[PDB]
């Protein structure tokens, strides 16, 4: 389980920084509209 | 540290939801 635990962690902290990621493309897009 | 980790994957679910709704509101503003 902590095994299992830690991947989780790690899976949900990648997809954070995918939808920062988006965020930031978005912000950009907002700023030239 | 069962129950840390526990904690961290809740936190790090709650920022998701958070940036998941950020997103589909940013991309309805700009037309997506």
Same mark, same amino acid.
């Given at each position: &389980?902590? /095994?299992? @635990? *830690?991947? $989780?962690? !790690? !899976? @949900? %902290? /990648? /997809?954070?920084?995918? %939808? *920062?990621? !988006?965020?930031? &493309? @978005? $912000? $950009? @897009?907002?700023? *030239?509209?």
């Amino acid at each position: &389980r902590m /095994k299992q @635990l *830690e991947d $989780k962690v !790690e !899976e @949900l %902290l /990648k /997809k954070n920084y995918h %939808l *920062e990621n !988006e965020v930031a &493309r @978005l $912000k $950009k @897009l907002v700023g *030239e509209r």
